[PDB]
Design a protein around this ligand. Structure first.
Ligand SMILES: CNc1nc2c(CC[C@H]3O[C@@H](OC)[C@H](OC)[C@@H]3O)c3nc(N)[nH]c(=O)c3cc2[nH]1
Ligand SMILES: CNc1nc2c(CC[C@H]3O[C@@H](OC)[C@H](OC)[C@@H]3O)c3nc(N)[nH]c(=O)c3cc2[nH]1
Ligand SMILES: [Cl-]
Ligand SMILES: [Cl-]
Ligand SMILES: [Zn+2]
Ligand SMILES: [Zn+2]
Lengths: 369, 369
């Protein structure tokens, strides 16, 4: 039977790695893209469809599920896996992003954050909620530092997050069933500052985690800056554990982040922008609502192996999205998630074969032609 | 290979019949429920899912498709079947209901109806649009008489519909490809008046059609009145051709209509009310949004064989619908359409076995308990 947690690296090329995370509920192939299913659903897809696209793991969110339908309620109903019908690993974010994104609803202190009906999150309560959900990969309760941030404020925020990381570790470890069956990831903060990123990495490594997320990016800094920060930040993390870049991203963001040592990704882009009419293709994104697609009999993408591209035309999907039809959202979402998984597969295969740098070059040349 | 059209009756019980319609694109088991797919989609379902529920045929609509995406456009793209990915029979309504339901947009004359951007429908143009869509069962262009109607106005409307029925027949017959590959149904009108229903039936039988719809019902008259009209109206139609009750209906409406000799049904109830939170069960409809379902682990219906009832709880679907999640619409719709198909299967089997009257009694006793 599978272990609680084992990360193995099978092949490398430069800073890029490919391998597997084995967990009780399944194997996760890395680099991995994790579809976002915040409210106990990957929007517009049955779990079987999410799996058919190639996803090994999906995300839920402590903050949203705490509010609706409720963490205790989900536990009473048998846990998130049973509730939504996904039996493979689930990673749950801790609420630390919402501490920032919904800060106007908040009162913050060293103890935690109260959101206003009032709901409280703290390292202890966040870890408890993730336990009640039956999360496989539990995220430490952090604060995603706003961008831009002054060095003083970035330091204060990071320091608090590191104290919260230790509290998260201790809360997780004290709950035997959780400690024995789930994994815990720490989240590096420090904004765009190398010295703070180093202090954060050192603090997290001293505490010790099963994996390490790069937090505080994909918050408006832009790709050049994000890549600059990754250049120095990822090498600070333990090499032998997974590296998870939270919130990233566009296909080219993912490719460049893998080149910089990232193993795991989540983003709402394929799902949300799919519902909005944006389809990803190897020749770049298209907006299916555009009149130029009204009589286009080609599939969304000419090479894509997904069920949508096997069966339906751009013209039909154009009609559905223009008409506000639910099937339009379903088809766009399935295609985009499948596209993302095919990207990850090509990345994994190219690293395995020692031709990832060539893949990255070819990918960019065509995607941005 | 299958004929253009052949209706065979395999078994009877009282006025009820069960059998098959064979057409080039497939066999339709009768009594049949036909899911409504007005805008080239059965809302929230892939065609494969519609088929998996047991549907043999679906409906499209001349009026809606003429407006968006356009009839000529669909023809250019290869026809409605290819466009939406449903390769089995499709019945298209003619626009005659919209003549009534959207009458404020209209200017009516003996030639046809113009809807106001202006779009025209006439017997000739309606039949042409249905050809462009590649419809298998083409409906005559009629007017659904408003309810209530005075005897004078009901007569005038019916008489015009009968003149339009002859024009529909001639338009269909003059188009060789359509005449050789599709079927044409006439629509009986006459409101709630026996003498007018008789005149209409006689006129339609004289013209001759492949099947006969009972039009002008399910327009607010209520079940007692609808059944009273069916009692005398259905026997007026040719016995050896299918009888199609347009727009019906709730499960008990369907059962009573089959008892009165109806072979085919369409209704938006399972799809539309499903999206609104109403689930059909053998113990009557439930509204899944009700707080009583928030922690109910049972499936929507205790006996239902559908994929939704095999996998997900009332509690989960309650959460999805409350949250406005697309998957909620998908799951409710699949279940309701599957329920309707299971109802039709039970009806067909019970007639075949000579126990339909007992089935109707048992069904009602439990559904209305
Ligand atoms: C978009 N860029 C981005 N996402 C980020 C997320 C996930 C948000 C999470 O919130 C929900 O979406 C709103 C999703 O929850 C499943 C998502 O994974 C982060 N989470 C934490 N805990 N800390 C961070 O520093 C952080 C930074 C991010 N940057
Ligand atoms: C609900 N009761 C009801 N429906 C009816 C329909 C279908 C409406 C059609 O319009 C679209 O839905 C709005 C659907 O189109 C596929 C539906 O089948 C009718 N169609 C014609 N041609 N003539 C009638 O006398 C008539 C009467 C009806 N009573
Ligand atoms: Cl999303
Ligand atoms: Cl509908
Ligand atoms: Zn595709
Ligand atoms: Zn069901």
């Amino acid at each position: 039977d599978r272990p609680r947690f084992s990360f193995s690296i099978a092949a490398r090329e430069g800073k890029a790695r490919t391998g597997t995370i084995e967990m009780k509920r399944g194997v996760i192939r890395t680099p991995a893209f994790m579809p976002v299913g915040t409210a106990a659903t990957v929007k517009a897809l049955k779990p079987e469809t999410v799996r058919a696209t190639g996803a090994d793991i999906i995300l839920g969110n402590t903050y949203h599920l705490m509010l609706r339908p409720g963490a205790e309620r989900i536990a009473k109903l048998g846990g998130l896996h049973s509730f939504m019908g996904w039996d493979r690993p689930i990673l749950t974010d801790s609420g630390g992003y919402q501490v920032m994104s919904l800060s106007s609803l908040t009162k913050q202190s060293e103890e935690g954050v109260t959101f206003k009906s009032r709901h409280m999150l703290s390292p202890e309560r966040s870890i408890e909620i993730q336990h009640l959900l039956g999360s496989d990969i539990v995220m430490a309760f952090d604060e995603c530092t706003p961008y831009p941030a002054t060095p003083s404020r970035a330091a204060s925020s990071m320091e608090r997050s590191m104290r919260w990381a230790k509290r998260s570790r201790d809360a997780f470890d004290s709950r035997k069933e959780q400690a024995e069956n789930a994994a815990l990831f720490g989240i590096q903060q420090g904004s765009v500052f190398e010295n703070l990123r180093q202090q954060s990495a050192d603090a997290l490594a001293e505490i010790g985690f099963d994996g390490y997320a790069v937090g505080g990016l994909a918050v408006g800094e832009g790709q050049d800056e994000m890549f600059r920060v990754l250049d120095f930040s990822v090498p600070m993390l333990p090499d032998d554990k997974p590296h998870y870049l939270m919130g990233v991203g566009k296909p080219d963001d993912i490719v460049g982040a893998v080149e910089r040592g990232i193993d795991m990704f989540d983003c709402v882009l394929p799902t949300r922008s799919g519902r909005n009419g944006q389809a990803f293709t190897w020749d770049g994104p298209i907006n299916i609502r555009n009149a130029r697609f009204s009589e286009d009999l080609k599939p969304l993408d000419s090479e894509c192996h997904c069920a949508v591209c096997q069966k339906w035309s751009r013209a039909y999907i154009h009609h559905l999205i223009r008409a506000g039809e639910i099937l339009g959202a379903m088809l766009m979402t399935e295609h985009n998630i499948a596209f993302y998984q095919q990207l990850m597969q090509k990345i994994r295969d190219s690293i395995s074969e020692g031709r990832f740098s060539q893949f990255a070059q070819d990918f960019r040349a065509r995607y941005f032609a």
